[PDB]
Amino acid sequence: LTDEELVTMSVRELNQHLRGLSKEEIIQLKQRRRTLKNRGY
Protein backbone atom coordinates (compact mmCIF):
# COMPACT_ATOMS: atom_id res chain seq x y z
CA LEU A 1 0.00 0.00 0.00
CA THR A 2 2.58 2.54 -1.08
CA ASP A 3 1.77 6.11 -2.08
CA GLU A 4 1.90 5.77 -5.83
CA GLU A 5 -0.34 2.81 -5.14
CA LEU A 6 -3.20 4.68 -3.46
CA VAL A 7 -3.63 6.15 -6.90
CA THR A 8 -3.14 3.17 -9.15
CA MET A 9 -5.67 1.58 -6.83
CA SER A 10 -8.99 3.21 -7.69
CA VAL A 11 -10.91 4.30 -4.59
CA ARG A 12 -13.14 1.28 -5.02
CA GLU A 13 -10.04 -0.87 -4.87
CA LEU A 14 -8.86 1.17 -1.93
CA ASN A 15 -12.02 0.94 0.09
CA GLN A 16 -11.41 -2.76 -0.41
CA HIS A 17 -8.27 -2.76 1.70
CA LEU A 18 -9.52 -0.25 4.25
CA ARG A 19 -11.92 -3.00 5.25
CA GLY A 20 -10.63 -3.42 8.77
CA LEU A 21 -9.36 0.09 9.45
CA SER A 22 -11.20 2.02 12.14
CA LYS A 23 -13.20 5.03 11.03
CA GLU A 24 -10.23 7.13 12.08
CA GLU A 25 -7.65 5.17 10.13
CA ILE A 26 -9.87 5.43 7.08
CA ILE A 27 -9.89 9.20 7.04
CA GLN A 28 -6.11 9.33 7.29
CA LEU A 29 -5.91 7.40 4.03
CA LYS A 30 -8.82 9.10 2.28
CA GLN A 31 -6.64 12.22 2.21
CA ARG A 32 -3.31 11.41 0.59
CA ARG A 33 -5.02 9.34 -2.08
CA ARG A 34 -6.82 12.54 -3.00
CA THR A 35 -3.55 14.48 -3.06
CA LEU A 36 -1.68 12.16 -5.37
CA LYS A 37 -4.39 12.14 -7.99
CA ASN A 38 -3.71 15.88 -8.11
CA ARG A 39 0.04 16.17 -7.57
CA GLY A 40 2.43 15.51 -10.45
CA TYR A 41 1.39 11.90 -9.99
Asked how this structure was determined, the answer is NMR
Neighbouring residues of 7: CB distance < 8 A, sequence distance ≥ 6: 33, 36, 37, 41
- CB of 15 within 8 A of CB of 25? no
Measured CA to CA, the distance from residue 38 to residue 32 in angstroms comes to 10
What's 24's domain CATH number?
A: 1.10.880.10
> Crossing angle of helices 23-36/11-18, nearest 10°?
150
Structural domain of 23: 1-41
Number of domains comprising the chain? 1
Q: Rg of the chain's alpha carbons, rounded to an integer?
A: 10
